[PDB]
Amino acid sequence: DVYAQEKQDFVQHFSQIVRVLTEDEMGHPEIGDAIARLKEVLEYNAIGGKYNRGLTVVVAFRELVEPRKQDADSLQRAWTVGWCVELLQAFFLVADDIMDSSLTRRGQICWYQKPGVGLDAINDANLLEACIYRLLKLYCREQPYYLNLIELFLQSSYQTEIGQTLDLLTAPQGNVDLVRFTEKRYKSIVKYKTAFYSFYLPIAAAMYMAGIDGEKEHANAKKILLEMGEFFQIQDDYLDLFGDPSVTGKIGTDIQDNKCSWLVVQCLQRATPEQYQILKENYGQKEAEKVARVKALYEELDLPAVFLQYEEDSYSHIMALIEQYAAPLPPAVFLGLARKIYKRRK
Amino acid sequence: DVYAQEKQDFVQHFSQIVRVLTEDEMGHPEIGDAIARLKEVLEYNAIGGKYNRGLTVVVAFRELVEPRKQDADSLQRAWTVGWCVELLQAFFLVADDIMDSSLTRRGQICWYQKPGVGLDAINDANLLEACIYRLLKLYCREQPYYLNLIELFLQSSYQTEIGQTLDLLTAPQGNVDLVRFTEKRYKSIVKYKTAFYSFYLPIAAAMYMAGIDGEKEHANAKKILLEMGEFFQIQDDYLDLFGDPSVTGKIGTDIQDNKCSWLVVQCLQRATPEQYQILKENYGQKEAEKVARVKALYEELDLPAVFLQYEEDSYSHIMALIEQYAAPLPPAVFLGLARKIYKRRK
Numbered sequence: 063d064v065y066a067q068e069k070q071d072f073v074q075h076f077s078q079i080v081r082v083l084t085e086d087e088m089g090h091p092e093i094g095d096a097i098a099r100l101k102e103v104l105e106y107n108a109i110g111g112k113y114n115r116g117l118t119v120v121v122a123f124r125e126l127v128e129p130r131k132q133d134a135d136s137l138q139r140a141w142t143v144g145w146c147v148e149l150l151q152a153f154f155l156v157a158d159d160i161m162d163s164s165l166t167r168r169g170q171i172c173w174y175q176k177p178g179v180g181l182d183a184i185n186d187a188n189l190l191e192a193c194i195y196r197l198l199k200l201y202c203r204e205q206p207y208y209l210n211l212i213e214l215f216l217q218s219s220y221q222t223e224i225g226q227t228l229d230l231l232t233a234p235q236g237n238v239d240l241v242r243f244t245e246k247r248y249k250s251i252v253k254y255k256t257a258f259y260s261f262y263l264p265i266a267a268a269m270y271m272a273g274i275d276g277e278k279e280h281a282n283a284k285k286i287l288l289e290m291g292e293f294f295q296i297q298d299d300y301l302d303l304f305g306d307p308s309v310t311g312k313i314g315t316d317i318q319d320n321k322c323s324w325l326v327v328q329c330l331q332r333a334t335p336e337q338y339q340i341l342k343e344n345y346g347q348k349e350a351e352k353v354a355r356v357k358a359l360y361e362e363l364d365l366p367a368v369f370l371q372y373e374e375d376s377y378s379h380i381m382a383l384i385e386q387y388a389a390p391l392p393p394a395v396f397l398g399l400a401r402k403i404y405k406r407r408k
Numbered sequence: 409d410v411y412a413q414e415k416q417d418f419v420q421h422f423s424q425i426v427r428v429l430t431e432d433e434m435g436h437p438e439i440g441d442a443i444a445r446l447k448e449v450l451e452y453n454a455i456g457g458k459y460n461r462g463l464t465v466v467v468a469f470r471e472l473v474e475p476r477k478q479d480a481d482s483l484q485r486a487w488t489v490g491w492c493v494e495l496l497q498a499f500f501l502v503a504d505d506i507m508d509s510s511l512t513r514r515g516q517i518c519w520y521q522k523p524g525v526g527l528d529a530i531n532d533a534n535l536l537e538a539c540i541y542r543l544l545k546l547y548c549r550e551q552p553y554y555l556n557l558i559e560l561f562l563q564s565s566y567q568t569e570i571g572q573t574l575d576l577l578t579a580p581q582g583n584v585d586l587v588r589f590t591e592k593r594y595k596s597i598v599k600y601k602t603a604f605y606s607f608y609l610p611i612a613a614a615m616y617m618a619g620i621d622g623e624k625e626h627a628n629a630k631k632i633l634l635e636m637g638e639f640f641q642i643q644d645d646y647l648d649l650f651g652d653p654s655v656t657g658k659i660g661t662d663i664q665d666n667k668c669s670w671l672v673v674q675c676l677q678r679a680t681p682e683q684y685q686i687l688k689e690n691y692g693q694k695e696a697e698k699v700a701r702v703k704a705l706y707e708e709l710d711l712p713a714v715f716l717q718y719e720e721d722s723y724s725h726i727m728a729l730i731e732q733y734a735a736p737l738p739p740a741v742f743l744g745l746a747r748k749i750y751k752r753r754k
């Protein structure tokens with residue numbers, strides 16, 4: 063919508079970002095090779111996704127600054143903060159792929175699986191985290207919102223690592239306990255691991271950039287953007303199994319990795335004592351046969367139909383939340399975002 | 409010296425730090441388990457080292473604030489920033505151990521080698537990075553230096569990741585090229601990977617905390633503290649091979665991991681065309697026999713004697729740098745630190 067409009071401009075700005083993060087060798091030639099490697103990391107890991115999050119920073123900026131106040135530089139900065147959220151993303155993915163033993167991301171092989179990278183990936187990832195704050199310094203240093211943004215990113219990082227910790231504690235390798243896999247636990251997980259950084263972070267960054275720094279303006283926004291995030295991670299769990307790797311750009315692992323996926327939580331609730339045992343006996347194991355038994359059992363309970371039911375009822379519920387809590391913000395900010403993820407298949 | 413004096417107080421402050429980083433569940437019970445895991449990570453990975461860096465923050469604080477201005481809270485904050493540098497350290501180690509395929513750290517098994525952790529270590533590490541900025545917020549939020557410290561830590565993180573990148577690019581697995589292993593390259597590596605965060609970071613943090621924020625006061629300090637860092641990493645490379653694992657708390661890997669160690673750089677400079685080939689043929693391989701051939705060749709060139717020569721001449725050179733550049737800072741700040749690392753064997 064407004065998103066599809068703004069992409070080409072956002073994506074072309076990536077070159078400047080890179081010309082800029084590699085202007086550090088235009089003062090220190092002894093680190094050339096490290097900069098080269100950094101470029102490479104960026105090229106491979108910052109590109110090829112949908113860019114929802116970065117664009118959401120820029121769309122929300124249009125919609126919250128009076129166009130008088132949108133000078134050339136105001137925009138350029140917003141492109142950057144936009145990119146700053148894409149770096150956050152990049153950093154999480156490079157490292158969640160190692161942790162999740164994934165094979166492919168955005169329709170290429172995962173950075174760590176590349177010949178000659180492996181676990182150097184862990185540095186690569188953190189360099190990407192670093193680059194955020196180097197951009198904030200280089201573009202927003204003189205702005206009233208600087209500190210708010212720095213605290214926002216870090217703060218959001220921390221909540222997201224917290225969420226990752228639960229994702230992992232709840233899904234221990236070679237230990238199939240399913241007592242653990244509940245509704246309450248699921249909600250907590252996705253709240254922390256996905257919702258703060260994929261949905262609040264980028265909107266609030268746009269709000270901070272427009273001088274809207276009020277506690278209650280952020281609290282309301284959050285009530286909306288968090289439930290939106292929950293829904294989005296459920297989408298993500300559905301696609302892990304039922305998506306198209308031609309389209310999602312990634313092969314699934316929730317079952318192999320013994321994950322507290324939305325799927326498995328719904329399964330337990332419906333399964334017969336009989337069926338519980340197929341699951342127990344096939345879940346969280348690297349064997350194709352056992353994975354398949356679980357997919358089938360999921361299809362046996364017409365869980366893709368329950369997905370579609372839930373996706374309709376949550377989208378409504380979210381719309382209720384926009385009616386209740388958007389004010390004084392243009393509903394469009396939240397709607398544009400909602401449209402871009404409802405009935406999504408990539 | 410002043411260090412040995414201040415430790416007991418610094419180490420006891422670790423409990424408060426933990427009671428404080430786990431007071432987040434005193435608002436959000438749904439993340440208990442993640443906090444538990446965080447405690448555990450901290451306990452295992454923040455403890456057992458020398459604490460040079462953290463103590464150096466606190467020693468330098470004594471020596472730069474007029475004792476009138478050292479109220480209870482002023483100290484407590486300095487303990488924290490001190491601990492903030494130990495968290496930085498913790499985070500780098502947890503993850504450098506994975507990247508370096510190390511077995512033991514501070515005389516226990518490396519966190520990632522623990523049964524039931526493995527590559528979840530990558531999250532664990534980043535949680536430790538997070539905790540720094542959560543402490544800065546919770547203790548130094550209202551201070552004039554806050555932003556300076558935040559930029560200092562991040563900035564220092566970034567330079568250290570840059571340095572890590574070179575460490576790794578220069579030491580590719582299963583690819584023994586020794587053209588790469590030069591003096592110039594070595595200096596660059598250790599400058600970035602060790603010196604900024606182990607030596608500048610903690611002193612400058614103490615300076616920022618004492619309102620000494622002048623460009624030239626930090627530049628001079630840096631000239632000193634960077635050369636000090638170089639020397640310290642050379643020490644670290646010597647101990648990798650020639651130390652006592654009973655004492656260093658860690659088993660070495662520079663040879664196996666094909667590292668641009670101070671040792672190997674000195675070796676090349678001295679070796680006969682004959683000897684160059686033993687090295688080429690045994691370096692960077694996981695085989696005990698081949699490692700041993702290299703150790704022996706190193707002992708063949710009386711490199712431990714060259715170490716002791718260099719350690720004397722650099723310590724002198726550093727002392728010259730303190731005579732030249734300490735002012736207006738108490739020489740003690742730099743000397744206390746120098747004494748604590750000269751002729752060091754752990």
Ligand SMILES: O=P(O)(O)C(Nc1ncnc2sc(-c3ccc(C4CC4)cc3)cc12)P(=O)(O)O
Pocket residue numbers: 153154155157158159162164222223226255256295298302530531534
């Ligand atoms: O691999 P995906 O793309 O399905 C997905 N990736 C994510 N989706 C939503 N939120 C998050 S947070 C996250 C992540 C990555 C790394 C870390 C730690 C290094 C900090 C923490 C969180 C990955 C991720 P997940 O099913 O693995 O959760």
Ligand SMILES: O=P(O)(O)C(Nc1ncnc2sc(-c3ccc(C4CC4)cc3)cc12)P(=O)(O)O
Pocket residue numbers: 184185188499500501503504505508510568569572601602641644648
């Ligand atoms: O393992 P050690 O203790 O000998 C030593 N550890 C370090 N010593 C001095 N500086 C540094 S910087 C560093 C490190 C760790 C992790 C990272 C990336 C995750 C950020 C970057 C740098 C480890 C390290 P090294 O010989 O591996 O260099």
Ligand SMILES: [Mg+2]
Pocket residue numbers: 158162229
């Ligand atoms: Mg994951």
Ligand SMILES: [Mg+2]
Pocket residue numbers: 158159162164
């Ligand atoms: Mg994953």
Ligand SMILES: [Mg+2]
Pocket residue numbers: 298299302
């Ligand atoms: Mg997923």
Ligand SMILES: [Mg+2]
Pocket residue numbers: 504508575
């Ligand atoms: Mg290393």
Ligand SMILES: [Mg+2]
Pocket residue numbers: 504505508510
């Ligand atoms: Mg190491």
Ligand SMILES: [Mg+2]
Pocket residue numbers: 644645648
């Ligand atoms: Mg070492």
